[PDB]
């Protein structure tokens, strides 16, 4: 008898959650929500181009009420697959919300039901209810929903202003969908596209590197995936790190307001 | 430094904006001379759009020959010129340094914003036959100049359904008339010669010419950025539209549209 | 027939048309004694809309046209909508709008008198026809509701702009319920359902039996809502049982509007 029931009564929290939801709705059409006693993770392990995304929330930073029971005491977790825009559309009016309730239900079929109690001046407030269709993922499939292992990065560099990067890759994408991203321990990072009739290279410098030769570590990637990740970030993150594994993968590690986001983009072909 | 052409701008927008006014073809021909740069795009013998940026607009501008010409992909060119975004903020400029070594070499762009530097290598092509519409002020039957600002809304509401746009200019009423003839609909746009918008009116004969409207549609881009526009037709029936555009530094630049009549 | 509009009334006439273009493909026009009547109907004849602009809505209103006539005509909604397409260009540049017709004329003339002496003339073609009518009686409807359009606008906000049908129903405590409706089959791709439960105090009037519920076209309702919200007017809904039509009404001092929508059986 697995179950989940949570509530948010704090305005700032309700909005923070909503923003995070709008974000993953950008990074992936479909995602998996992992529920634990103290956390909530949004997971995308779509292997193709096997780009992965791992988002983690600390339940206590959002909910004033939180309760769940996994499949079994031993493995006290729950994995629900859902359509991202569904969760965003549900949080659509949370701007004028007094409270938010989320609860795993099974009326017509399994759903994550979200109830938004709108702000009111009387004793009776308007209520918006949304029944989000979810698919419970069986324990056997949980293995393919674990956060990717982080092989030590050849280079780990602080990322530049994301809005600026977005603009640049936005335009580069109009020229090619292949992109080379490179960086070094000297605080330099370059974005590069090369086609027969036009080449473009954007040089970022004085970026800094985290403690612990200056040849660069590079990696060829699908530009559309880099655009996706950047398009998702609504604001420049507190801590934003780019970790590259020469010719193998770029790994982004963001930490904005106690909410970490790990995006993984593998090399091409 | 054997560079046929070298140019610089503390503000790329003093170039990218004008170039966007004539961006309806993927390719354009660049013509540089001691006096400045002329970019031209053509639509197969029917339409020609030219943008001219006088050398005085640039901070650095030098040509090492009598004239230098080359063809480039305008779309890529504009994509690179706005590599840093299209919504810059006050006090946030993107500078440009253009370099074109010579025949057979790529156009090089160097842009920097906030210290970030973008390098662009845009291959050049062999120019092609560039149409010649010699709109001599001695061939001009009628000429008119309007205040661009108040024509934008109206001009964007031209029934694109009709395949043609008919222009009427005359010393008699109506003075200046644009007419369409679309799906079960005849429509007319009239501007009186004594209008506040009418800064100059010199029609000494009644002319009525037709043009395929879709050929004239792209002329809207230039209209939006201009502050003035003069309209002229000649004895052949060709249309000439000259747009006066003021850049961010108050300097003036012109865009010109020529269109053959429809028969 | 001659109708001359000025001031803000030009912009409101434009809105009425946009709002009408969201129901039917043909615009029916009847200059009546008590006002200009603009009507349209569904492509399936399941929706009916009508706006009646009282005489004082115009600066000059002359229903009768010289020559053997008593005008009743239909015009391509698209052609008429193009005239008022840009509510922006209206609000700003347009000062006067004059709609005219002669007995020996073949086209309907709409002439916008714009700033700086600019003038735009539209010659629309029309077809003489019979008065467009529908059958419905609000007075015999057992249930009705009345609330400011702004409020219903908020009631419909949670749903998707693309939602086709919606269910309106009365709950206990006199709570009004709006629920998204869909079709289809024990297949996957089950749709998310949204429900909005409104307080009783949100309605100026509510006379319906609990458990009562009807489903209708939201895309079409929104046509009347948009016009009503902007004009900040109250909206009434008169309905019966599933299968009978739902009647949506608004009433200003210079105009009347009715949208008669069908309900699933
Ligand atoms: O008094 C209400 C009664 O009038 C009718 C019949 O005349 O409606 C007429 O007037 C409406 C506009 O007020 C038109 O939309 C309608 O087409 C016309 O018949 C009845 O329909 C209504 O119950």
Swiss-Prot record, chain A:
Tissue spec: Ubiquitous.
Organism of provenance: Homo sapiens
Gene Ontology BP annotations: cellular response to ionizing radiation; DNA damage checkpoint signaling; DNA damage response; DNA repair; double-strand break repair via homologous recombination; embryo development ending in birth or egg hatching; meiotic DNA integrity checkpoint signaling; mitotic DNA replication checkpoint signaling
Family: Belongs to the HUS1 family.
Keyword Cell cycle attached: no
Keywords per UniProt: Cytoplasm, DNA damage, Nucleus
First and last residue of the signal peptide: none
Gene Ontology CC, one term: site of double-strand break
Compartments (UniProt record): Nucleus; Cytoplasm, Cytosol
Highest taxon listed in the record's lineage: Eukaryota
Name of the protein: Checkpoint protein HUS1
InterPro entries registered for this protein in UniProt: Cell_cycle_HUS1, DNA_clamp_sf, Hus1/Mec3
Keyword DNA damage: yes
Gene this chain is encoded by: HUS1
Assembly notes: Component of the toroidal 9-1-1 (RAD9-RAD1-HUS1) complex, composed of RAD9A, RAD1 and HUS1. The 9-1-1 complex associates with LIG1, POLB, FEN1, RAD17, HDAC1, RPA1 and RPA2. The 9-1-1 complex associates with the RAD17-RFC complex. HUS1 interacts with POLB, HDAC1, FEN1, PCNA and RAD9B. HUS1 does not interact with RAD17. Interacts with DNAJC7.
Function description: Component of the 9-1-1 cell-cycle checkpoint response complex that plays a major role in DNA repair. The 9-1-1 complex is recruited to DNA lesion upon damage by the RAD17-replication factor C (RFC) clamp loader complex. Acts then as a sliding clamp platform on DNA for several proteins involved in long-patch base excision repair (LP-BER).
Curated annotation (Swiss-Prot), chain B:
GO terms, biological process: cellular response to ionizing radiation; DNA damage checkpoint signaling; DNA damage response; DNA repair; meiotic recombination checkpoint signaling; substantia nigra development
An example molecular function term from Gene Ontology annotations: damaged DNA binding
Pfam families registered for this protein in UniProt: Rad1
InterPro entries in UniProt: Cell_cycle_checkpoint_Rad1, DNA_clamp_sf, Rad1_Rec1_Rad17
Keywords per UniProt: DNA damage, DNA repair, Nucleus
Localization (cell): Nucleus
Chief location of this protein within or outside the cell: nucleus
GO cellular component annotations of the record: checkpoint clamp complex; chromosome; intracellular membrane-bounded organelle; nucleoplasm
Family matches, as CDD domains: PCNA
Tissues of expression: Expressed in testis, uterus, bladder, spleen, ovaries, lung, brain and muscle (at protein level).
Subunit (UniProt): Component of the toroidal 9-1-1 (RAD9-RAD1-HUS1) complex, composed of RAD9A, RAD1 and HUS1. The 9-1-1 complex associates with LIG1, POLB, FEN1, RAD17, HDAC1, RPA1 and RPA2. The 9-1-1 complex associates with the RAD17-RFC complex. RAD1 interacts with POLB, FEN1, HUS1, HUS1B, RAD9A and RAD9B. Interacts with DNAJC7. Interacts with RHNO1; interaction is direct.
UniProt family annotation: Belongs to the rad1 family.
Role description: Component of the 9-1-1 cell-cycle checkpoint response complex that plays a major role in DNA repair. The 9-1-1 complex is recruited to DNA lesion upon damage by the RAD17-replication factor C (RFC) clamp loader complex. Acts then as a sliding clamp platform on DNA for several proteins involved in long-patch base excision repair (LP-BER).
UniProt protein name: Cell cycle checkpoint protein RAD1
Organism: Homo sapiens (Human)
Gene that specifies this protein: RAD1
From Swiss-Prot, chain C:
Gene Ontology MF annotations: 3'-5' exonuclease activity; double-stranded DNA 3'-5' DNA exonuclease activity; enzyme binding; histone deacetylase binding; protein kinase binding; SH3 domain binding
Catalytic reactions on record: Exonucleolytic cleavage in the 3'- to 5'-direction to yield nucleoside 5'-phosphates
Cell compartment(s), UniProt: Nucleus
Recorded GO CC terms: checkpoint clamp complex; cytoplasm; nucleoplasm; nucleus
Main location: nucleus
Chain segments carrying region Possesses 3'-5' exonuclease activity: 51-91
Family: Belongs to the rad9 family.
Protein name as annotated: Cell cycle checkpoint control protein RAD9A
Organism: Homo sapiens
Span covered, complete protein: 1 to 266 of 391
């Amino acid at each position: 008898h697995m179950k989940f029931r949570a509530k948010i009564v704090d305005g700032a929290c309700l909005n923070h959650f909503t923003r995070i939801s709008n974000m993953i709705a950008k990074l992936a059409k479909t995602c998996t929500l992992r529920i634990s006693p103290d956390k909530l993770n949004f997971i995308l392990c779509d292997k193709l181009g096997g780009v992965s995304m791992w988002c983690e929330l600390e339940q206590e930073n959002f909910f004033n009420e939180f309760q769940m029971e996994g499949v079994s005491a031993e493995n006290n977790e729950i994995y629900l697959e859902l359509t991202s825009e569904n969760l965003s559309r549900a949080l659509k009016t949370a701007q004028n919300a007094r409270a938010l309730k989320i609860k795993l239900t099974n009326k017509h079929f399994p759903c994550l039901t979200v109830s938004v109690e709108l702000l009111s001046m009387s004793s009776s407030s308007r209520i918006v209810t949304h029944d989000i269709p979810i698919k419970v993922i069986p324990r056997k499939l949980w293995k393919d929903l674990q956060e990717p292992v982080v092989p030590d990065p050849d280079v780990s560099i602080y990322l530049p202003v994301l809005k600026t990067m977005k603009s640049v890759v936005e335009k580069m994408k109009n020229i090619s969908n292949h992109l080379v991203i490179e960086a070094n321990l000297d605080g330099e990072l370059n974005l590069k596209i090369e086609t027969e009739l036009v080449c473009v290279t954007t040089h970022f410098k004085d970026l800094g590197n985290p403690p612990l030769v200056e040849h660069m570590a590079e990696v060829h990637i699908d530009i559309r995936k880099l655009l996706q990740f950047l398009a998702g970030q609504q604001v420049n993150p507190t801590k934003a790190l780019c970790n590259i594994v020469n010719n193998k993968m770029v790994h982004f590690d963001l930490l904005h307001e106690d909410v970490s986001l790990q995006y993984f983009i593998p090399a091409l072909s | 430094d054997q560079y046929s052409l070298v140019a610089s701008l503390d503000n790329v927008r003093n170039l990218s904006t004008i170039l966007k006014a004539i961006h309806f073809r993927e390719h354009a021909t660049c013509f540089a001379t001691k006096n400045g740069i002329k970019v031209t795009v053509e639509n197969a013998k029917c339409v020609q759009a030219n943008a001219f940026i006088q050398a005085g607009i640039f901070q650095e501008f030098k040509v090492q020959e009598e004239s230098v010409t080359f063809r480039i992909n305008l779309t890529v060119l504009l994509d690179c010129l706005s590599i840093f975004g299209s919504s810059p903020m006050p006090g946030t400029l993107t500078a440009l340094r253009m370099c074109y070594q010579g025949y057979g070499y790529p156009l090089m762009l160097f842009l920097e914003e906030g210290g970030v530097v973008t390098v662009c290598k845009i291959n050049t092509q062999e120019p092609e036959e560039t149409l010649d519409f010699d709109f001599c002020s001695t061939n001009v039957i009628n000429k008119i100049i309007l205040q661009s600002e108040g024509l934008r809304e109206a001009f964007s509401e031209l029934d694109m359904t009709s395949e043609v746009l008919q222009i009427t200019m005359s010393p008699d009423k109506p003075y200046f008339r644009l007419s369409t003839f679309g799906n079960a609909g005849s429509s007319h746009l009239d501007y009186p010669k004594d209008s506040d918008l009418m800064e100059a009116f010199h029609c000494n004969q009644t002319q009525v010419n037709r043009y395929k409207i879709s050929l004239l549609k792209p002329s809207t881009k230039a209209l939006v950025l201009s502050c003035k526009v003069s309209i002229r037709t000649d004895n052949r029936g060709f249309l000439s539209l000259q747009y006066m555009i003021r850049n961010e530094d108050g300097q003036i630049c012109f865009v010109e549209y020529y269109c053959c009549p429809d028969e | 027939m001659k109708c001359l509009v000025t001031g803000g009334n030009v912009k409101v006439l434009g809105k009425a048309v946009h709002s009408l273009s969201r129901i039917g493909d043909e615009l029916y026009l009847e200059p009546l004694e008590d006002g200009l009547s603009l009507r349209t109907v569904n492509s399936s004849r399941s929706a009916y809309a009508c706006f009646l602009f009282a005489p004082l809505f115009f600066q000059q209103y002359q229903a009768a046209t010289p020559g053997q006539d008593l005008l009743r005509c239909k015009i391509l909604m698209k052609s008429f909508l193009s005239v008022f397409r840009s509510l922006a260009m209206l609000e700003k540049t347009v000062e006067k709008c004059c709609i005219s017709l002669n007995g020996r004329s073949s086209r309907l003339v709409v002439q916008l008198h714009c700033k700086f002496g600019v003038r735009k003339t539209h010659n629309l073609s029309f077809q003489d026809c019979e008065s467009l009518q529908a059958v419905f009686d609000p007075a015999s409807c057992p249930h009705m509701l009345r609330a400011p359009a702004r409020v219903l606008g908020e009631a419909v906000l949670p749903f998707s702009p693309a939602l086709a049908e919606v269910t309106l129903g009365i709950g206990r405590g006199r709570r009004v319920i709006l629920r998204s409706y869909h079709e289809e089959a024990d297949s996957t791709a089950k749709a998310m359902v949204t429900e909005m439960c409104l307080g009783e105090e949100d309605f100026q009037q509510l006379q319906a039996q609990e458990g009562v519920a009807i489903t209708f076209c939201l895309k079409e309702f929104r046509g009347l809502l948009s016009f009503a919200e902007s004009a900040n007017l109250n909206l009434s809904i008169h309905f019966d049982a599933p299968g009978r039509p739902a009647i949506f009404t608004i009433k200003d001092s210079l105009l009347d509007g009715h949208f008669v929508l069908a309900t699933l059986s």
